[PDB]
Amino acid sequence: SRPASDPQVVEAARKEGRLIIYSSTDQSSAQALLDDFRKLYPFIQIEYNDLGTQAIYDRFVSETAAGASSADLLWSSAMELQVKLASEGYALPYDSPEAKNWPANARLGNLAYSTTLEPAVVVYNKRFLKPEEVPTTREGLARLLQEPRMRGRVATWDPERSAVGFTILKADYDRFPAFQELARAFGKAQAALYSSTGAAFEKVISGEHYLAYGFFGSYALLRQRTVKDLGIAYLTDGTVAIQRVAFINKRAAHPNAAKLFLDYLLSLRGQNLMAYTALIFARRETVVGEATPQALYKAVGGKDKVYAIPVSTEILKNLDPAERMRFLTFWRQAVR
Ligand SMILES: [Cl-]
Ligand SMILES: [Cl-]
Known part of the structure; x- marks a missing residue:
């Protein structure tokens, strides 16, 4: 299928031609998503920085404070650090057309999104x-x-x-x-x-x-x-x-490529590729593969036995x- 990104965003991303990612997602787990996104958008070169959760936060804060070149998109499992950044002015506001039925506790309005x-x-x-x-x-x-x-x-x-x-x-x-x-x-x-x-x-x-x-x-x-x-x-x-949190750098040099990659991650196509091929446990329930909410709920004995940490400013209590x-x-x- 094709992520429902606006055609104007696709053209603006083609003019950028480049996506810089800072991610905690092991490249072994991310590679099939990077390869499928390059199939969808062959005109975008991806730079994938596989980095520790604390290193992503410290480097992004430093590079931002220096006025220096940083990531277009940040993707990290350190939920509190991602919510901290996205609620302190580091996130580009963007309403993903792939996130219309995200629960309110899986997104920070338009600032950041659950991806897993x-x-x-x-x-x-x-x-x-x-x-x-x-x-x-x-x-x-x-x-x-x-x-x-x-x-x-x-x-x-x-x-x-x-x-x-x-x-x-x-x-x-x-x-x-x-x-x-x-x-x-x-x-x-x-x-x-x-x-x-x-x-x-x-x-x-x-x-x-x-x-x-x-x-x-x-x-x-x-x-x-x-x-x-x-x-x-x-x-x-x-x-x-x-829930691995993704947000776009407010100061991204390639904001539209970042929008394309966010929409891809949230799409049926991206979430199915997570569930079936990457074996990343998907956020979406309407997926086929081994790494699905359905497989998770069956193994633990019901959805009521899963505590999903919300993508919420409430979790900053932990800091x-x-x-x-x-x-x-x-x-x-x-x-x-
Ligand atoms: Cl260690
Ligand atoms: Cl949930």
Whole structure:
């Protein structure tokens, strides 16, 4: 199909000829979307900057303050940082014609948009834990992590080095009382903390760890295609879902190419390519593939077991110094 971008926006984007992206989306997961968008619009050269969530924020703020060349479009899983920027004058207002039935809590008016509904899952190495050994609750994982064999065998986020690690563990702490028991079991099991999914997965795949808690189901699905021993367990007591936020740089040199790429990401075409080929868990329900809301809800035991973090100015509460203090004081003491 063809994203419903205005023909004037397509022509203005052809005159630009170039799109600069700053994204936290691993290029391995983004590549089929970049390739399909280039098929749709062969007259746009894409520069894809695969970067950490905190680095995207710091670099965009710096380059903007210097009056320097920056990104046309920012795409990041660190929801609070994206909502902060889009609510402080960094976002180009644009009403996507592909976002007409987005819920109000999946967009910041016309400033920024949900592009995904991506669960925080458990991944494990089947050579070391069989599917039957891997509990699907915070209470059951706390019990497994009491076992001597699990000491040194757990990976999770470092929320002090990954801004999305903070997004995901902060939401878990806020919504699930059992997260506290689980965090103390991270301490008991001497959990190693990582600033990226890839660094935690590498250790699970080698067997250095048996289990990783809280990383993107999107990355796990795609890694499974080439790594037979990767298992995925979905939490049935409650699953945190992030929504990768996209917004256009207010000072983009190529605003129209950015509009085309945003509309593509939100379109049936982009969302189906996410669900079927990229194996990024799509935001849209009307999709076919393995990485769908329907597949997520079936695995966790209903939509009511998913807490989707909203794309809302309300989530900036998580950046309040007292709220960061409460979470990080509890966290640091539990996991050491
Ligand atoms: Cl790391
Ligand atoms: Cl939702």
